[PDB]
Amino acid sequence: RRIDCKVFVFAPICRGVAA
Protein backbone atom coordinates (compact mmCIF):
# COMPACT_ATOMS: atom_id res chain seq x y z
CA ARG A 1 0.00 0.00 0.00
CA ARG A 2 2.75 2.41 0.96
CA ILE A 3 5.57 2.63 -1.55
CA ASP A 4 8.79 4.31 -0.57
CA CYS A 5 9.83 6.41 -3.54
CA LYS A 6 13.20 6.76 -1.85
CA VAL A 7 13.78 3.12 -2.79
CA PHE A 8 11.16 2.32 -5.38
CA VAL A 9 12.03 5.00 -7.88
CA PHE A 10 10.94 2.72 -10.68
CA ALA A 11 7.52 2.26 -9.25
CA PRO A 12 4.70 3.43 -11.50
CA ILE A 13 3.13 5.21 -8.60
CA CYS A 14 6.22 7.28 -7.90
CA ARG A 15 6.09 8.31 -11.54
CA GLY A 16 2.94 10.23 -10.70
CA VAL A 17 4.93 12.48 -8.39
CA ALA A 18 7.96 12.14 -10.63
CA ALA A 19 6.93 15.38 -12.27
Concatenate the DSSP letters of all residues of 1-19 into one string.
----TTT-SS-SSTTTTT-
> Quick check: 3 and 11 in contact, CB under 8 A?
yes
**How far apart (Å, rounded) are the C-alpha atoms in residues 19 and 1?**
21
> Quick check: 8 and 17 in contact, CB under 8 A?
no
